């Protein structure tokens, strides 16, 4: 098992190996990877939510930024 938290069950929400906010695995093209902790975040789960993926190279999540 890659992920011990969800044992890679696709019908299981997992905030560890999928979107850290909602636990969803859908839209990996819209999941930002934090350049610090490497957690994933749907742009639409962020607050505020982003309409598109930022073009800027570095992105840090609500938890790792400031």
């Amino acid at each position: 098992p890659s992920c011990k938290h969800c044992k890679d069950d696709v019908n299981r929400l997992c905030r560890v190996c999928a979107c850290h906010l909602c636990g969803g695995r859908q839209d990996p093209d819209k999941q930002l990877m934090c350049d610090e902790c490497d957690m994933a975040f749907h742009i639409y789960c962020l607050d505020p939510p982003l309409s598109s993926v930022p073009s800027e190279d570095e992105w840090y999540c609500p938890e790792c930024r400031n």
Binding site: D29, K30, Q31, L32, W59
Partner: peptide, 5 residues
């Protein structure tokens, strides 16, 4: 930004 992709 990097995405899971």
């Amino acid at each position: 930004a990097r995405t899971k992709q």
